[PDB]
């Protein structure tokens, strides 16, 4: 049964340069770890606060590191990345691909997925599938075989929708992940900055394991989005619409079909789905306006109710 919440944890990138050397000053302020106030207006809370100054590491163990523990226990997970061009999505969910201190989430979760896996007992034994794609303009195209750009969503028995036809490359060490998504960002270059700002990236992680002895099988997907620039647009407003019928909820039965992306995240937008979003936010007043609807957008989000099973 179950029943929690989105989880919602929101990360200011520092200033840049265009601001350090245009002046600016810092907007926001920081009280507890969960709490952000904006100049003089209304404080925000979330399940966690993340200042410019807080690493890689530390957003992992804050919004994955559990999402990770639940997939490992037959639970689907989804982590996320909302926010406006520049704010620190990609750096968040990416990182330095190969730094291990500058390493994002992806990287990250790929580790701590084999480092469990390697604890565990020789029964139970896992099968890990991959596939990485992007979306643009209502169209999926496959990252790991540049000869598919339009791929169609469909549905399993259980009435939920998975995209079909998609590459599958197979893993069994966080090496092979990481080669995966090198991959994909090389087929990107079969073209760029433009289009990668607007692009939304989906990394999805298969993870089936069955205990031999017993035969009982748990699975669980996980998908690491890094979506594209929710500033002033089509896939994101769907998203909005899909996250603004639910902060009330009753019989509005949301559009969820408006938009692939959406029809992807169903699951993980009111489903049996751990899902927690990371807000990327400006500390710049020159972006004081999308950070705030960003907040918005993110404030409402935590409102939502996941009812989750073990599959
Ligand atoms: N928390 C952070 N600490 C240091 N640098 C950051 C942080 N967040 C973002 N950046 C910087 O900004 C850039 C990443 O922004 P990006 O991930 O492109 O935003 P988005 O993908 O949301 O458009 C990188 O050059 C990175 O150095």
Redesign the pocket.
């Known amino acids: 049964p179950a029943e929690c919440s989105i989880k919602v944890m929101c990360?200011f990138?520092?200033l840049?340069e265009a601001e350090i050397l245009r002046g600016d000053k810092f907007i926001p302020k920081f009280k507890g770890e969960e709490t952000v106030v904006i100049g003089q207006g209304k404080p925000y809370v979330f399940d966690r606060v993340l200042p410019?100054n807080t690493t890689q590491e530390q957003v992992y163990n804050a919004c994955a590191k559990q999402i990770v523990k639940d997939v490992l226990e037959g639970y689907n997970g989804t982590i996320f990345?909302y926010?406006?061009?520049?704010?620190?999505?990609?750096?968040?969910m990416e990182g330095k691909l190969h730094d291990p201190q500058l390493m994002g989430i992806i990287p990250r979760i790929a580790h701590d997925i084999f480092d469990h896996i390697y604890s565990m007992d020789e029964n139970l034994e896992f099968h890990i599938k991959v596939s990485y794609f992007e979306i643009y303009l209502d169209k999926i195209r496959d990252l790991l075989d540049v000869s598919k750009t339009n791929l169609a969503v469909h549905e399993d028995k259980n009435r939920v929708p998975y995209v079909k036809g998609c590459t599958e490359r197979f893993v069994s060490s966080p090496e092979e992940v990481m080669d995966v998504i090198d991959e994909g960002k090389a087929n990107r270059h079969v073209a760029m900055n433009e289009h990668s700002?607007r692009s939304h990236s989906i990394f999805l992680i298969n993870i089936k394991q069955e205990n031999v002895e017993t035969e009982k099988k748990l699975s669980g997907k996980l998908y690491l989005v890094?979506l594209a620039?929710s500033e002033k647009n089509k896939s994101l407003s769907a998203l909005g619409n899909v996250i603004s019928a639910l902060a009330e909820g009753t019989k509005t039965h949301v559009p969820y079909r408006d938009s692939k992306m959406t029809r992807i995240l169903q699951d993980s937008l009111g489903g049996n789905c751990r899902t927690t979003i990371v807000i990327?936010c400006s500390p710049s007043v020159f972006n004081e306006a999308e950070t705030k609807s960003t907040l918005m957008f993110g404030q409402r989000a935590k409102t939502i109710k996941n009812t989750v099973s073990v599959n």
């Open positions: 990360r990138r520092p840049n410019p990345a926010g406006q061009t520049s704010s620190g999505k990609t750096h968040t700002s890094d620039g990327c």
